[PDB]
Amino acid sequence: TEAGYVGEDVENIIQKLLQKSDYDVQKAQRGIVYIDEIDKISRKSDNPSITRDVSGEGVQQALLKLIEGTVAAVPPQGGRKHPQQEFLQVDTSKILFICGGAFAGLDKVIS
Amino acid sequence: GEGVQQALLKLIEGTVAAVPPQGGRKHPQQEFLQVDTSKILFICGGAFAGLDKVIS
Amino acid sequence: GEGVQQALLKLIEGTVAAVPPQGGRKHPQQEFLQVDTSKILFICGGAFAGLDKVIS
Amino acid sequence: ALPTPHEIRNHLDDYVIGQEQAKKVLAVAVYNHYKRLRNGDTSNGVELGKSNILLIGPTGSGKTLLAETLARLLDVPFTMADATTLTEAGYVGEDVENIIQKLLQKSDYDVQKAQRGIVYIDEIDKISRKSDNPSITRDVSGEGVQQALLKLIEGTVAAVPPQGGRKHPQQEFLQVDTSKILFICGGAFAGLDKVISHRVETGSGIGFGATVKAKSDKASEGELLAQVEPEDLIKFGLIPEFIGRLPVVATLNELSEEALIQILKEPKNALTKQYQALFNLEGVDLEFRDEALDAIAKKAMARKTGARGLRSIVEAALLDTMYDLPSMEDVEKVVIDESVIDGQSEPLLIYG
Amino acid sequence: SALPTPHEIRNHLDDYVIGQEQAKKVLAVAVYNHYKRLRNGDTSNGVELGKSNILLIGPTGSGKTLLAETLARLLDVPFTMADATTLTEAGYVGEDVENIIQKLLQKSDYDVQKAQRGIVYIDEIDKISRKSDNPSITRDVSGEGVQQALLKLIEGTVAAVPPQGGRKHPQQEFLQVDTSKILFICGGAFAGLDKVISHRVETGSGIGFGATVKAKSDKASEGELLAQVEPEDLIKFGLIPEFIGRLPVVATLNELSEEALIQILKEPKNALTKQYQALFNLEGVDLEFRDEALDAIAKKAMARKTGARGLRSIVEAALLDTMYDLPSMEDVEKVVIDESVIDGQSEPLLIYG
Amino acid sequence: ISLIAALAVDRVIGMENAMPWNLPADLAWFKRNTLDKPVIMGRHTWESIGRPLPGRKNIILSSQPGTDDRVTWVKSVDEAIAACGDVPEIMVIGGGRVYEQFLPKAQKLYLTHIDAEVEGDTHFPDYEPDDWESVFSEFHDADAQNSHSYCFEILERRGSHLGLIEV
């Protein structure tokens, strides 16, 4: 979900990558990611932009800089690290990001 | 709705979840202790009111 | 949305922001450094998808 | 001796141009505060109160500008705030008590001076609740901030964080009274004009007996804002308790084409003068013809951003000029005419 | 002991507040109750008396907070005023309810006896009526959460009261303080309660010829609705039922009328007219307010819907122009304000001398 | 991480110089809440104690290199927080360099609020008067043998965040 809400944030993705990279930013900056179900965050034909689709367009608007490269604000701590204000900085300009979905209905659009 | 059924779709087939390590008097582990959900028998029940007619 | 716009109105013009004093050289325990922002050039950027129709 | 309101108004006209009403409200308010401080012994049964002002003006009118100008002439501690940062008590966001903290820093720990000061809470219109209807969720940044400020305006003893201002070694929370501190709020209240129209204008409907204006004869935003009443502010999302703590209500008027022309040359730090300094520090003179100013005024009105609109018009007219002129040689002065503002012609640079 | 009587104190409260007879009497009897309790500490003789916690419900500008300030002048026991909007649950970075007793100790001079015999006025009690739609993720640091702590404190429980702290530490004596003998006065303008009370007492309207349809002028005021308040109404507002039960006496104020407003302008010790008259005389000018103009101001204030606070708006506006040029002009002796000035069609005449 | 300490008036606790009071009441409570815990001591504190502490996983955070093995020696704050790891409680008891370096990463603060009036160059940083809320209260008013007070307290910090849920 978009930032400032009860759901999850797009920076959590980078937190899981550190658990597997022994909290080594250098190694974490050269890892691969796979975002499953990328077809469920697609606008439900709401082209007029009636309301804020924090689960759809809202999540897509937050990844536009993660896939390209930006100084992400990693969650306070999900490892040995005791403090929270540290807000570990990481660059995502060399981190591959795979995205998979089923896009149920796209076959009709193509035809 | 459909969204709630989508999240559970993964949990039942393995997920490295992040659970706060607390409630057991300050658990020594403080790294969002993981739990593999690919070995837990998920006995999902329910009373499908109407299925009897659908089948007939 | 609007909430983020309402907070930058004073920043882009000038205010006294408080930065958490952690790291570097941040001697003040709780005397949050006052950084005037009346001389900081801000360069926003966006795609504004859909604005073309409004103009048309 | 104490300064008279007329003197204050002169100080306020060096920087602002075209707001007569606001200059009086602030002048009398300061006059009252100055005498309310000298007479601190209160040698009379009466308990002199205080009146809080609420400057309501459209975008780019000089709300924040006036507050800054006041700090130049007055002597007592003055502070500025931003209501968008304030949050209800008990959250990571800033607390209302921080205001006094910032006031103590400007007061030099002189509690007596701090107990008689003037605050200027800006962006007071962004903290307005969703609507008069009850709030389904706790609006930490909305009502919470308003309800938390109620006691500060009527009077209370805020607990300011210790080891601050001009005292590092302190543990006992310093106490300060907020019964003699004039809090001058200020906001833009965009969207209020519609609320005001629903009261000042009635009968609008379809039929032979209804009322229709076509926006040609309809009153302007400034006119509507001068008829604002507390009942209107409640619709905007301001709890009635908050408005009651702000008895005085000063309304600004949307700048006029004539006034915009005066803002370019009369003020002490007028926009034009700022640009002239740039061209002058590098070694070139700059002047603007009277006809040029008139064109700029008309274009700015279209932007609906007040004096801020001017900077856009000026920057565009000389954008290309300011990019190539630094490299040009044998140049002594530049002159911009009305034609340059529309693009039909190009600035005539006087070589030498 | 118990030297002051209810009638005596009522004559002192009327010097500052005009009206609210029920509120004055309720505050009077409860004040006297505490004094009668003081005779033997907590009326320990046989049957033990319950508390007299009051619940002040009044519109804005009615005189709720004013009553607390004027009452303290005539009182002898320590009295501390606290705002319910600055209290947060224990542990958080915000203030804790425990500090309320600390404030009282300052008035009490750290005297445990005098401390437990003080009065605690909690203003803005209507601001912690939890409105959240059962999220359960986080807590209401400025809602129900605080009530749970304040409720256990009023029913009578030992309180953590660290000594003043002149030195680096107060040695955490945390002397227990009994709150069974302390008197609590919770107040605040429950903005919106009128609608809640309306539904319970709503006669119900229809559309035909036999329905009960009334115009806006023919409706009931919040003051009248408040008088018919019941505890159930407070629960809907977002208050714990146990909390309101602890406060048996509920005092409902009455919306001020034109007559009441005219008196407030001239009769009170520190009325608005006297306030402006004092500073006008401090500069060396006499001001006279005709009775005709006074009623005009009240008519305008009744439309602002801000109670007595509306009055200052009308006056400041009327005298804004006058107060701006008056300090510069000379040869001025007195000023007289007429009804026309309030309307805005005339300018106050000056007695040049 | 809990920075157990006393913060004697003027922060005169004493690490470079052997503890002035050296009272059993302060060492008993210490031992009680430190046994087997990775107490991150330091060079100045090691000088004043010296004696290997039974059980306690001593970690001497020293600017110089490590010599002894019985009691571990660490040089960097990263190496000091790595040895202990993520255990539920770390009783950092080292020098001022250690005390202040670990202050940004402290959750609890087992204070003792001693009153002993001494002087020196070893001091502790300041403590947030509002963030650190005292949850535990135990009075240990100065006794005949216990020259000054040794009031044990526990502190912690908490904060709230909104969620702004929609539909």
Ligand SMILES: CN(Cc1cnc2nc(N)nc(N)c2n1)c1ccc(C(=O)N[C@@H](CCC(=O)O)C(=O)O)cc1
């Ligand atoms: C310098 N110093 C640090 C010290 C002293 N008192 C404290 N008291 C408290 N509450 N907390 C501490 N951080 C603390 N630290 C000392 C001094 C002696 C011993 C000591 O000899 N401890 C004994 C315990 C006492 C005993 O049984 O002999 C042991 O066997 O480990 C340790 C720490």
Ligand SMILES: Nc1ncnc2c1ncn2[C@@H]1O[C@H](COP(=O)(O)OP(=O)(O)OP(=O)(O)O)[C@@H](O)[C@H]1O
């Ligand atoms: N009457 C005026 N005379 C001269 N300059 C003005 C005037 N009004 C606005 N300005 C210009 O606009 C800027 C100030 O903007 P202004 O204070 O009107 O914003 P604001 O409406 O107070 O913002 P906010 O909505 O946050 O209160 C200054 O840089 C100033 O040069």
Ligand SMILES: Nc1ncnc2c1ncn2[C@@H]1O[C@H](COP(=O)(O)OP(=O)(O)OP(=O)(O)O)[C@@H](O)[C@H]1O
């Ligand atoms: N009956 C009265 N007589 C004289 N003055 C009054 C009266 N009622 C209110 N006032 C004036 O109003 C101010 C006090 O406001 P009041 O205590 O009514 O606010 P409140 O209703 O407690 O606020 P809230 O609704 O937020 O609780 C004082 O300055 C006082 O002069």
Ligand SMILES: [Mg+2]
């Ligand atoms: Mg401004």
Ligand SMILES: [Mg+2]
């Ligand atoms: Mg009040």
